[PDB]
Description:
Chain A: GTP binds at residues 10-17, 57-61, 115-118. By secondary structure, chain A is of the alpha/beta class. Chain A is built from 5 helices and 6 strands; from the N terminus they run E-H-E-E-E-H-E-H-H-E-H. Chain A has one domain (1-178): Rossmann fold. Helices cover 33% and strands 22% of the residues of chain A. Chain B is mainly alpha-helical. A two-stranded antiparallel ribbon of chain B has the order 1-2. The termini of chain B are far apart.
Amino acid sequence: MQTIKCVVVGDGAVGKTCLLISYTTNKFPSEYVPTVFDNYAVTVMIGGEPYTLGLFDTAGQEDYDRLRPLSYPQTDVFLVCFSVVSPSSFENVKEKWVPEITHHCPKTPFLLVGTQIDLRDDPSTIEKLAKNKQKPITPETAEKLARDLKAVKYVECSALTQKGLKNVFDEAILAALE
Amino acid sequence: GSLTNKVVKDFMLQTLNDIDIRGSASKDPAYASQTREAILSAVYSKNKDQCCNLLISKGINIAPFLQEIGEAAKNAGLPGTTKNDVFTPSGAGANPFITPLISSANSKYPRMFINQHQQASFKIYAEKIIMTEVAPLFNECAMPTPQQFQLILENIANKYIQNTP
């Protein structure tokens, strides 16, 4: 009966598809993570009423500036994603993503989403960033940017362990109905 | 009352008309090229998932197969990156033309998208009309047509499949 359109944006390789799949199947897809996310319409009861949570991935569109906006119309809430182990993706939230969605949907709330937090303490990941004079993004650092860009809030999760996964979407729903 | 799958499909057809890929493509060469890459990336993605799911269910390793379609994607003109000797085109993921059709139909007729089978059927129908709409954009083009590319990947896949049971 009621609908909520949520669009997941952010740099490629940030785990957008994975977190969408991990959330809709309720388990990390071991060994093989599908390239195409298919569970776009999640039916859920909210405030005693029937709803459909429309989830839309944007993976593979990071260089398609002419096609990307096609997904934006009537969006009730955006998930601007970045990997906490990818400084470039984090910087692009400010330099690219928020400016783009704000331009097409100035009145649509958005959540800043930190992904792949399971990798934050991974020795091998940490050393690759150090070799580049960088360190993984901490939530304090992320919260500062979420404040700067006027995000509804900052949330992080791991598609792999699912820690924080469900909260991300509960918050999205709240933001959408806010 | 009425409200059938046909009603929803026709609406998606209406929405495809509103986005008008052909007209946009004719007025902006960048839109056209992006469309071609996006489309061929969707063909890649669909075949990658369909074959990988099969292979994995049969207990086969997908690496050598991914390596080959990666090369096919590369030769198709799709940019990308290589990891563990396997090339993956950057456009692989979500077809940018699908969401406007699917998100709009779900918003207008949500009761028709509750059933999982129906969801899949509408997505498949959307892919089909999108493919038909974009075909002429590949006329007299160096890139393979979506039809040729799909055939190229299927033959590759078929080679791995006939070596499994």
